[PDB]
Each structure stands twice: as structure tokens, then as C-alpha cells.
Curated annotation (Swiss-Prot), chains A, B:
<feature type="modified residue" description="Pyrrolidone carboxylic acid">
    <location>
        <position position="1"/>
    </location>
</feature>
<feature type="binding site">
    <location>
        <position position="13"/>
    </location>
    <ligand>
        <name>heme c</name>
    </ligand>
</feature>
<keyword id="KW-0574">Periplasm</keyword>
<dbReference type="InterPro" id="IPR015984">
    <property type="entry name" value="Cyt_c_prime_subgr"/>
</dbReference>
<keyword id="KW-0479">Metal-binding</keyword>
<dbReference type="InterPro" id="IPR012127">
    <property type="entry name" value="Cyt_c_prime"/>
</dbReference>
<dbReference type="InterPro" id="IPR010980">
    <property type="entry name" value="Cyt_c/b562"/>
</dbReference>
<feature type="binding site">
    <location>
        <position position="67"/>
    </location>
    <ligand>
        <name>heme c</name>
    </ligand>
</feature>
<keyword id="KW-0349">Heme</keyword>
<comment type="function">
    <text>Cytochrome c' is the most widely occurring bacterial c-type cytochrome. Cytochromes c' are high-spin proteins and the heme has no sixth ligand. Their exact function is not known.</text>
</comment>
<feature type="binding site" description="axial binding residue">
    <location>
        <position position="120"/>
    </location>
    <ligand>
        <name>heme c</name>
    </ligand>
</feature>
<dbReference type="GO" id="GO:0005506">
    <property type="term" value="F:iron ion binding"/>
</dbReference>
<dbReference type="GO" id="GO:0020037">
    <property type="term" value="F:heme binding"/>
</dbReference>
<dbReference type="InterPro" id="IPR002321">
    <property type="entry name" value="Cyt_c_II"/>
</dbReference>
<dbReference type="Pfam" id="PF01322">
    <property type="entry name" value="Cytochrom_C_2"/>
</dbReference>
<keyword id="KW-0813">Transport</keyword>
<keyword id="KW-0249">Electron transport</keyword>
Length: 126, 126
């Protein structure tokens, strides 16, 4: 869907920004600093679910740029396992949110965050 | 969810960018230049549905900036009717996509586009 590689870069950056917001806005809740409203979090995690699937299609062939390391393309199978692990942890977060269980939510939240960082450590420029 | 007004600006700009992409990528399909796969479009419109609800919460009190005109806040009821009309036209687009009907899709697509422009004409800086 991208006329030029820069358009793919702008899309994925925007998608990832929207993820950081829907993920990070729950930090005060999982820390207990803000109240836990199970329905609120269920709805937010549904949004995060949808967003979490979007960036990866914008790293298609020919879309080198931004802060994406070139190894995303030369090690396509590894990069796909980091996105899959992340998306599988998002499924676990959705399950915790759907269950309305704050303990399970904070554990699942931590697993998601670790998956973000694992990908950044390998595939995002400094 | 925004520490500073600039964070709300960056969020809404990112959300709107993701909308322009999920909306605009269907242009070749509604023009007949690309093939119509009803399931493909149904899935894409489901993404657009979700995205279409996101920008508005990032024009909250105190978030003046970007290319948002100040009248968004001083004429809050008018701005809310432009976002509601847009979101109602998104519902009609979802119905067309769910029905798998290209005629209905192209009419609903046109109505959505007109609603984007109507809001821009009143509330987006030049
Ligand atoms: C690899 C499988 C990734 C996972 C999982 C996550 N992110 Fe990431 N992120 C990745 C790359 C390769 C990049 C660079 C993209 C580019 O072309 O520049 C990023 C970038 C971000 C950004 C910055 C976006 C911007 O506005 O420029 C943010 C805020 C970000 N990523 C956040 C984030 C979060 C919160 C994640 C888990 C919920 C996460 N990312 C996962 C690669 C990957
Ligand atoms: C008012 C109810 C709007 C409707 C409906 C749509 N948009 Fe819009 N858009 C609006 C404003 C006030 C702004 C400025 C935001 C800011 O703070 O800068 C915008 C901006 C855009 C952008 C640019 C985003 C960026 O990266 O800076 C795009 C690409 C955009 N809008 C597209 C768009 C489309 C395709 C719409 C219908 C599907 C649409 N917008 C509706 C206000 C409103
Ligand atoms: O909210 C965020 O979480 C991850 C990372 O900090 C998790 O360790 C990230 O990159 C964000 O923007
Ligand atoms: O794809 C788009 O459609 C609207 C407008 O052009 C409809 O007339 C808009 O602002 C986009 O970025």
C-alpha cells in the first residue's frame, strides 16, 4: 500500500507510536498507581490487539529506512520469530484482560514489555 | 494518557496517518484498477473501524497544537458532530464491506471521503 519506501517507514513508525501509547498507558494500572477497571482494560487491550498486528506488513521488501536495522531483511526468519513471540504474548495479555485478573495482567504485561525490548535490542538502530 | 500536549498531538497525527493509509489503500479497488476480494476488504475495513475511533480522544482539553484549529475546542459541539458523522459513515462502509458488494462499497467509500474533507475544511489548518 506504499507508493515509496518512506511511506512504509512513516506507517510503521505511526503504528508503533500508537502501540507504545496503548501499551504504556497501562503502566500506572499494573503498578497500582491508578485504579483497575477490568472493562476499561479489556477494551484498551482489544485496541492494542489490533494495533499489535499492523507494523509488520510495513517492513516489506524494499522498505529499508528509519531506525530499522538491515538485518530485519537479511535475517527474515529471526525477525519473524521476534514478531511472533511478541504477538503470542499479546494473546496472553488479551486472555488476562478478558479474565479481569490484575495479577495475571501484570505478569502478562511484563512478558509483552520484554518482547518489545528483545526485538529492539536486535533490530532497532540505537 | 499523555504527559504533555505534544504527546496528544503526536498520537492523533499517528492515528490519522494510519487512517489515511487504511482508507486510501482501497482507492484502486473502488476504482476497479485493483481486484475486489471481499474478504480482503472486510478485514481491512475492520482495521479502519478500530482506527477511526482513536483520534478524537487525543483532542482532549489542553491539547492545542499541530495542525488542529483552536475552533475544535471553542466549538466542541460542532466538532463532535463532524466526528460523529464521519464515524457513522464508517459504520455504513463496514456494512457495505460485510455485504461484499462493490457498488455499495464505492458509494460508502465516497461518503466517508466527503466526511474527512468536511472536517478538514472547518478544523484543520491550511
Ligand atoms: C520487532 C519484532 C519489534 C517488536 C516486537 C516491537 N518493536 Fe518497537 N520498533 C521496531 C523497529 C524495527 C522499530 C524501528 C522502526 C523504524 O523504521 O524506524 C521500532 C520502533 C518503535 C518506536 C518508535 C516509532 C517512531 O515513532 O519512530 C516505538 C515507540 C516502539 N517501537 C515501541 C514498541 C513497543 C511499546 C513494543 C511492544 C509493546 C514494540 N515497539 C515492539 C521493532 C519492534
Ligand atoms: C474531524 C472530525 C476530522 C475527520 C472526520 C478526519 N480528520 Fe483528518 N485531521 C483532522 C485534524 C484536526 C487534523 C490535524 C491534527 C493535528 O493535530 O495536526 C487532521 C490531520 C490528518 C492527517 C495528517 C496527520 C499527520 O500526520 O500530521 C491525515 C493524513 C488525515 N487527517 C487524514 C484523514 C482521513 C483520510 C480522514 C477520513 C478517512 C480524516 N482525516 C478524517 C480532523 C479530522
Ligand atoms: O512502552 C514501551 O515499552 C517498551 C519497552 O520500554 C519495554 O521494556 C517500549 O519500547 C515502549 O515505548
Ligand atoms: O485518503 C484520504 O482521503 C481524505 C480526503 O482526501 C478525502 O477527500 C484524506 O484527507 C486523505 O488522506
Amino acid at each position: 500500500q506504499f507508493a515509496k519506501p518512506e511511506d512504509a517507514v512513516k506507517y510503521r513508525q505511526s503504528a508503533l507510536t500508537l502501540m507504545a501509547s496503548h501499551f504504556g498507558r497501562m503502566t500506572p494500572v499494573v503498578k497500582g498507581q491508578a485504579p483497575y477497571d477490568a472493562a476499561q482494560i479489556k477494551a484498551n487491550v482489544e485496541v492494542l490487539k489490533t494495533l499489535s498486528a499492523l507494523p509488520w506488513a510495513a517492513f516489506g521488501p524494499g522498505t529499508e529506512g528509519g531506525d530499522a536495522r538491515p538485518e530485519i531483511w537479511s535475517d527474515a526468519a529471526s525477525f519473524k520469530q521476534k514478531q511472533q513471540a511478541f504477538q503470542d504474548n499479546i494473546v496472553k495479555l488479551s486472555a488476562a484482560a478478558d479474565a479481569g485478573d490484575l495479577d495475571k495482567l501484570r505478569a502478562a504485561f511484563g512478558d509483552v514489555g520484554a518482547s518489545c525490548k528483545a526485538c529492539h535490542d536486535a533490530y532497532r538502530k540505537k
